[PDB]
Amino acid sequence: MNNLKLDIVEQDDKAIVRVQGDIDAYNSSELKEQLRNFISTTSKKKIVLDLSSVSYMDSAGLGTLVVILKDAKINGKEFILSSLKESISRILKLTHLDKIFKITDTVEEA
Template sequence: MAIKFDKREEKDKLIISIHGEIDAYHSGEVKKFLKDAINETKLPKIVLDMSEVNYIDSAGLGSLVALYKDARMAEKELVLASLKQTVMRIFEMTRLDRVFKIVQTVEEA
């Protein structure tokens, strides 16, 4: 399954919707797209709408951690929103739910 991205700006945040799986096959593409978005936007907050992400593996988690660091270096906040229960469970098992700010809906971010 191919991965797709949608970008939109809303008030003080850039919202990026991810459609597909963040796995070893797609993590490079995810990392490049999001890194470019972090560097291009002037907005202080980047929200990843993950409502259409059904699966994430260790490569995908690694990419998100690297992007989290990139965002912090750029003095921007990276927020994850609308995680499916299966994806949230992976964040909890790896304790990355304590690293990332994770919210139920995009509007909460």
């Protein structure tokens, strides 16, 4: 159970979570619980995951993001994925998860 570094910055109406590392079976449980806790103790209405440094995701990772999106909405927050690298934009289009996730080009746009 390896990498996964979270750099969180809150400004405007956004809680920006810069994710370093890939989101896969080795750190998806860690990702879920950090986001879980953060969502419960932030005043911001939008939670933006800045994936600019994420190059890979596996099925465990996609499943975790899907449920985190749900947990966020349960909490009354908007969840957005921003600054995807082409490999991830690719994976989301192929699996049609782009029909579920709100996705912006840049974090500022969210």
